[model samples]
Target: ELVKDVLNVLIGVVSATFSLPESISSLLSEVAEYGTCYTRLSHFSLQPKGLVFQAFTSGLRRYLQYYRACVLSTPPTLSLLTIGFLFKKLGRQLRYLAELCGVAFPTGVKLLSYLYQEALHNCSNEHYPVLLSLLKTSCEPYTRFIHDWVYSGVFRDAYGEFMIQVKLYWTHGYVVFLKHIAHDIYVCGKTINLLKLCVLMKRSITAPLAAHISLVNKAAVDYFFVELHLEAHYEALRHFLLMEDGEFAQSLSDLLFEKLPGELLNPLVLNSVLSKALQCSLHGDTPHASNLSLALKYLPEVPDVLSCLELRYKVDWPLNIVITEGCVSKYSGVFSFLLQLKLMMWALKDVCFHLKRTAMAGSVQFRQLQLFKHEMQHFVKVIQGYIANQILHVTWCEFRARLALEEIQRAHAEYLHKAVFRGLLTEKAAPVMNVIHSIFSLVLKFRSQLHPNFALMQQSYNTFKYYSHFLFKVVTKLVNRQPHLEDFLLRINFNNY
Candidate 1:
């Protein structure tokens, strides 16, 4: 009878239920309830009584508190309401605790799975059933979300806790996911959504709706690139923005040279001139060329109007997802840099022509001017070749190869821009570019002079030599990381400068 009574006491103490013996009940009479009305005072709250039990109870209570805090915290606006699912799991766990007379254990939804898995591994076999039950309930809501997205292309995330968010624009929808893992999921859902539209239009379905995700992804990619002509848009960017089209470059240079520097400052005048230039280019009649517009910025720091020029390309709907405003801005940077180099080359050639007509070939002035012109021409040509071949061409090939092999994303475009920027000596190579810019300014100054001073000419020549040496040293140091820079070093050092 004593052993039976002791067993009863143990059960009651652990569960905090049923009537206890008078002596044992009196001992716990002064213990206060630490839980809310929805929570029960189980063995978790029986603290400060048994020293060994207190250690485990305190830890369990702390974990419960952490779980409760996570559930109660409001998610950010426009974000996924993932916590709501955990709330439902919490309610279920509480109910199970009441029915089975179990301890209140911590559980979470989505993110909490990691913790639950770790807990299951470390916890004893006796506690496995309780932990597993909570984990199962916690994951149910997330599973439903995934199923809805994959099967029906339905975005049922009311609280916005899911990784994928739907953005509707006109007849098309764009899926934005928070993480890389959600990218494939977005593609799968997007395929189903597109198919759903097709089915509605035809009022019939031919292909199996339950086809594998990989097959759907490939089909969607084909639809985007082939059917929508995405590659055409990419090629358009390369041809015009990268200055791959030779006729476009020649036409732009002729028009620009015809207009006075100050005359091009007028936005209206600049736009009209740019339109006429585009009209004469090879692809000027194409829709892509029609989308290109030139904007002038009167930036005080710029040495010439060419440096302040911005090229804008209008991207619409689905293509805009890949060619975002940010990507366009990067293209503008490369465009302006190339345009400036071309302008410098044209200016040097014009100066050389005038000097040849006016001065005797044997005169000191004519010889000095001729030498300067050749050096400037060689420098600009080599740099342009380095950018076009080593940088832009190399990166574009890699980007195209990747686009052909794997799924395309905005990141790939971003990678191309970043690589081009690095190769153009824009960001990390700012120091080298600054010296080159100073040399350009000196040439412009020398060209504008009515009678070029011998001292001024001598100083400019010395400055060019110093800048060239600096470039050689910098390029040598940078060649290891930027292997393509080796070509620039080889070309520049070939003449033993």
Candidate 2:
């Protein structure tokens, strides 16, 4: 039954070959090769026990080499399909030879080892597609090696301590032939499937494959980002979203959103992803950004909302637009879910690198999403310099309130010394302390940074002095509008430099 099923697969793989150009020479050559493969297997299987071969006998390796050599000597153009059929025959031959010798049967690892060495010694890039297809279809036989050795050894030994036989195949079967392996697995819809195994099993592949997968996934992302009319790559995108582990999901999210080309954002997609991220953030999701403000930081080379519109759409933006209503703040939460991920530094560096690249109009697509100069300059400086911690946030407003209180205390002392205590003022000397009360209330309203920048610090310093000397005026302004006080301190303008 197994043989019949595998033969069916082999039959399907060669179905296209019959349609090749008609030529007596080509036909004869193909038939001759197929007959040689069949006859060689017949000798191994249909033999009368007289010419018996032991599993460990030198003849085993020789037959293996001869088998591969038969496939290699076939017509180059017909290699892909021809090799597939030849490989199936060889597999059956190996199984029969192993059963014939029973107890001395060579393991799957031995078979793959010899095959890899022979192919490496004899094959070239011209044979890659053919060998890759064969490897893809025939991997199941060798996977016995993976099951018995790699999986078993990983569980029994130290993590990442792959068996030596397994490493040999990994190095030769996948690493040496990485592009060919990736191409085959990707086309077979197994890239994500194999990756899940690597991640869960702690396979030696996690790190290297992660990078390659990122590149492939981002190409898909860029394609979908710009070609909004299309809905292709749903499987790939859904695979990323369904990742259960934080690191895998976060790495994928950064590759999809933060590291995308700035110009790609110029093409339209629904604004809902960012909005959903913000809503998630607002509902106590730690890494979620409540607005594009934090999300702007995620964009590799894009600007705050206002600057993005201004540069990409030629719209004139107001001074506070980038800070208050920037695309960074609005559209950024698209990847806020990643903030919960622990593997941040490299992911952040990856994001920053892309931004710097896009900022300079560096993309294969030649698209640029220019950030507002001053806002982006500061955005880069601060994110690198400090961490953005939201838990138990104690803003600079507390410090400013402390300063304001000190000034009020000084005035209180002055009033007591020169007027109230000195008996120079009448009993009706009533002083309204609205500004002092307002200063305390201001702390509840403002959401400044934990450590203010030079600009914010400078503005707060000047603000403290203003409230100290002009308490009535400060009270009137604070009463008229509480948010205006936050604006006074947060107005960071760095273009003057």
Candidate 3:
């Protein structure tokens, strides 16, 4: 009779309603609640508020159903009060649930990361399958989000758990975790959309193949590079902006020198001259030339046509992804800098012609003027050669090689930034470039004078010499850390100035 009574009490305790002594009952009640909570959790039929919680509840129910049938058995072989393993497993499940509930709003992404970590840690333990199941189920929505994006270019994240988000008209994808993979996923979705749009525009149908992540990624990239003519656009940027096409550069220079001095403030006049220049250039027949135009950006303190000149390229939809406004702006800086160097060379040559025609052949002033012209021309030529060889040619080769291997917008931007850095146009090199600009301006000022002061010329030359030498020492001091600047050092120090 005592044993039967004790059995009844134990069953009552397992059911979480009855207990032994007060102290012991308190602890037993806590353990017993695991089973009680499991039962309650299993009966969760109403839709849950959070996606992660819903997925977790559904997974927990599945795990519990399996746990009851297999571990406990249909004949009820184990009691939650008597079996330590059964009690501990139930505790583990409840602990996870408690941790999840602790969060204000758990996302599938956050939960998946947690589950993945737990799965890795417990691969040899009994909890592995539980974690594995939870991870698989929790990841369904995330996979669905990716699948929709890659296949249909759709952004249907109802719960805001996705890394991709639409801001006004532009869609942006980013995540604190798994940045590389997230970027690739974003690009793939964008490529799919671009392909569809392009097809629609030309009355042409387009598509992708297979649902496998890697397979889909490859197909999107392939379509982006091949069908969209990414290489052609890339080449167009190189030829026009970088002035790789010599005839176009010459034509532009000729027209700008003629027209820029007259109407430096009028964008309409500059743009018209630019159009005519483009039409007469080597790439005149190309459709890409139609997109090129000039703008007058008023820069403070500098009163030069080249300083105010900005090149504007109208990049369309898919190509704009790579050749963004920021990218084109970088190109404009490089182009304008190159054009300034060319202009300085031309101005110096004109000074030489004027000196030869009008100056007394055997006079001391004539010889002094002749020497200054030679030195200034050498300085400008060396700078131009360094930019053409060390910065533009070398960087373009490396950029093209990388693009061929794997084309990405990040890589394209990286190349432009690197070129700007290597070309000594970055803020870090701004001091040296500022001094160089001052020298160019001084030479122009000297050229404009009918009777230039030799003493003033010598004073300015000394100042420039001091600054250039000081900059050389600074550059040399940091050359070990930045080996690429060695080429610039070599060029500047060629005449040991």
Candidate 4:
């Protein structure tokens, strides 16, 4: 009786201080804390008199009974909040109790699952951060609970419903949560990994459920690939593509193709993709000849005239000017541009080289390559004409300076003649006429004056000579390897000009 009274007083005092309706709940939580902080009471028993309560063994039982009563007494309306608060206050100790009691945490997991589901549907954006935070904090407990359920095979039954919750959370379900979890936040990814573990581990499911999960997974994998570009999940795509079920693999492929925009059609982006694809092909015997052909189909029909024009001014003139200015050795910009042109040429050659080796004589890819080669021939012709024109313009500009020089010399000679004639009549002529002649001579000399920079015409000629020789060498080697390119370079020079 004395022991009971003491415990009763302690519970009353603590509960009164806390102001919670269930004061016993507070007492039970404190008892759990005592066990967790040090050594927990492992034994509990009551004396026949119902007065002698053992604090070690019987103490644990007393607290359990108290907890049960508090739970039963909680109003149905308030039970959810009351129970959550009590368990949360109990914290890790309650989980420890579940371990010590030789029982599973069904109650805790059930309640946790219920709250998660409810939060998915009923929680508003204002409070969603709180829920997500708590969810993140309880990652271990949640993961263990889910793992246990999956191992017991109970998840098979709950899988569909759970996926529904997943769908809601990821899509229309947790709009507010997504705003916070998007970006590189790893929590969302880890959570999905857990969900994936559950679905993939569940061996068999109804066709509809399987399809549903597959679609969800497909959408997720796509997000990883497209939006995120996470290479970590590339193996996931390959696994799907190589599935034993041809229908399923084809379905995935179809889904992928559907999601994909402008595969070969997008030249700007497709080149990079095809290049990478080609690089990877080196790991195996499979060739990219067909891929190259497919790429050709999307290629510009008559070449990009505007782009070529841009190349003329942007690349060609700068190169020509660099040489004309006698700074070819010092200026690397023109060389870099020329190297870029060379790189493109190399790609064309590689495409042609491999196509001939791998593609059959009359195959579509072979035919396409031939056609592309023809277009390239025409493009080369155009480029040669442009180069010739640039050289001609430079030469013509030099001629203008030469014409100015001759004009200056003629004008100077005429000035000297008049000066001599004026000298003979020096005593008879007025000084004003000589002054006027002096002014006239000066006018003529100054009017035909040429810039000293024009004296660097030899540098300009050297520039043209260097560029012509370099291009000729490249074109010659190209034509030697591909006889079809003979017409591409025939008479394509500034030699006659």
Candidate 5:
């Protein structure tokens, strides 16, 4: 009784001193509305709390609705995506208007972004597995959303730009999280609370990342094995890190990562990594330390794009830019813009290399060096071109880059015709066609400026102009334009999508 009173007093005092109830509620309401567009949370609050809190009576009844709401399945993600579009469009216009009045986002976008990250963190941690499963069960509707004009990759580009302004804050939030985990593993050594680590690492790793995965690997190594601590759990990290001994690695494979039914390697996949690193060093005959570091650098199934993940639904879908007919397809339409530019640079590099060789044809030893270099060069170039050109264009190389407006029009016509013939268009064509028309108009606006533009810095700026200006970037302008139809085209980007 005395101990309970002491602990309860401690907790209440801490909560009283630090809790920001009003601010938290405000932030919660905003993000909840933004993500779910929920009119109210009263309904969800009534569900049994048997899922996570079954073991203990939760004292925070006021937070029940918020907790339950996190588990309440959201509408088709595309529906939320549309709402996001409207909010973002409104924000951008407000920013533009503020700038016109010699101000910038009279309401700070940073604050909203910060609040968003906070809300995202809160919602994701709430263990709403059932709701997440339902959201990800089918992929067809999302694919159609991607095909639409307003809810497309071009829209994401705009959001990506906004994120760049606050990218560090969000990224720093992410990095700080990793650092804390490392610090805990270091200080506590093997005594670290691994359940917490598993939860944290799973969520962080599952998202397709803007930052490199090597950073994550290095942090884990330091945390698990190498921090300043008394003779403690860090030793376990050392044993695992070395895994130079196959037997030790196997032991770890069994004990440390835990086991699952019908599995050779432990569920953590850590053992497989250790084993691979060992083979690479021993059989492959590489330097041991370098091999170990390389092994540590490995990342598993990281997303190709991170923004597509909902804070709550990390790794929920197979994670394509769009979900259509149960297939997750990447639609980096604007990303293709940079790809196109890089293609041009690569071509120029080859052209220059050939000209240089011709210019210095009199040297024989140099010719041999150039021969080896040429072979390697062509190998890489062929791979890059194959992925970028063959897959995207499906035509001859020369024809691929310099596709005339007529070519795009034909492809657009074919796609539109198919949609109509398949009867997918009448049911959903206007919005899809509107999106295509907007893309075509964007193409027309920059028809002359598509590629061969040497100024690399202009790519983002051009994209911004494409979104903000009325001249060509408008998606809905290609069809029956409503008075405020512009609000529907939300600007997001690759990193955020």
Candidate 6:
């Protein structure tokens, strides 16, 4: 019954994608990928507490990228239909693997793990050429020797003692471990507590994926990324209301806003949107500018586009993004939902790494919404910086706001440019190219060194490995965003120099 259902959805999604319009198809495709990220994260979290596969450094990227293509090709209806099929197949496959293992598979985790192994086997060269590179990438690493050590007799035994006495970086599956923990917390429904752990771990976790700390403190910086990105994402998503077609894009207003027994669609943005409409009607003022301002104001608060995608990261819900009847767009605003979604996901990801490294309940996506709100609160100041950058884009609001904003914009750009390059960056001219390399070098200089204590966490050791992220951040902030300092602080003062 399950197999038949999944197959039906898969075929339906593919068939519907061919019949849908361009925009709706693209939206659905994104939802599908979102589903994958969510489910995988949740499954890994609820474990004897182990790591999810390292997808970024691993091969899952190509598979996901290809999957993205699949969704964008279909319409939203097709995409959702596709997701329905994919999850059904996922369920059947999980069952088959469980039956074969004869392990009395009862829990979602074991069932998930069963399906994952099968997925690794089934992702093939003949079936999906574009996706082939990805499957091979993940398979090679999993089959390697270090994998055996991590999954060996010692590791599985240590579960509950993960936080107080474990060094996560001791193993290669560092990121995976955090993702697993993140989902575990979510499925257990201790989301807020999980967030507090991450906040505590801000001091405990590794610096960041980028490792480019600013004068901004951990709490401060997290506030910027989360709120700033959310504001942009949801504000952008609200524009879907302006959409008139479902022939191309998806009709995914329901996935996040879908009925949850008692709840209707999100009323925050929807309410806010209506408020603006009323304001426009009553004031008898310029509506476009008003709408643009509203979009800018609210954008930083929305953390993710689809809540269902968020659910996956929390619980390993069986789903994937899909797009039916897709046609790529040249629309500036239309394609940007994809970009905005990308940024929101990446920003949340950046924060999650820090949360886990310090081992705060060590959950990744957990409590991200709070962190997002907090970031938005602080990031409003940086609006000066963003607005300054906007001169290149043109926003006309004169007065102290514009003037101070212009100065910071000028100074930050100068500081950014002069701290490195001495001349014009024109490509037509041979231009100083080494400055770009210098930036990369700067970031790498702060790369968080791995600890050798991850095994301790898996084996329920004394405590999760502790890294001095704050210490490094403080050092880097001083190193990068020095006070009243200029080019002299950049190269000539290199530590060894």
Best by TM-score: 3
Root-mean-square deviation (CA) per prediction: 14.1, 28.9, 8.3, 29.5, 31.5, 35.1
TM-score for each predicted model, relative to the true structure: 0.65, 0.19, 0.69, 0.19, 0.14, 0.15
Supply the global lDDT for candidate 2: 0.33
Candidate 5 lDDT trough over 10 residues, lowest sum = 305-314
Model 5: how far is 179 from its true place, Å?
A: 51
What is the Å distance of residue 18 in model 6 from its true position? 98
lDDT (tens digit, per residue) of candidate 6 on 444-464: 222222135433323221111
Model 4 agreement with the true structure over 307-368: per-residue lDDT tens digits:
11000111122122111222212122222222223333333454456446553256543453
Error of 6 at 439 (Å): 12
Task: Assess each prediction's global lDDT (C-alpha) against the native.
Answer: 0.58, 0.33, 0.64, 0.34, 0.30, 0.31
lDDT of 3 at 308: 52
Please write out the lDDT profile of model 1 over residues 263-351, one tens digit for every residue: 55777777787777776776657777777777765644313424567778787766665565676787776677778777777777677
Among all windows of 10 consecutive residues in model 4, the one with the lowest summed lDDT is 304-313
**Candidate 2 regions with alpha-carbon error over 4 angstroms:** 1-44, 47-110, 118-180, 187-497
- lDDT score, residue 97, model 1? 42
lDDT of 4 at 77: 45
Return the top candidate by lDDT: 3
Ranking by lDDT: 3, 1, 4, 2, 6, 5
lDDT score for candidate 6 against the true structure: 0.31
Of 1 and 2, the candidate ahead on TM-score is 1
Per-residue lDDT of candidate 5, residues 297-317 (tens digit) = 223342011111100011112
Q: What value of lDDT does candidate 4 attain over all alpha carbons?
A: 0.34
Alpha-carbon runs more than 4 Å astray in model 1: 1-144, 157-187, 190-211, 299-306, 359-365, 405-407, 450-459, 477-481, 495-497
After superposition of all CA atoms, the RMSD between model 1 and the true structure is 14.1
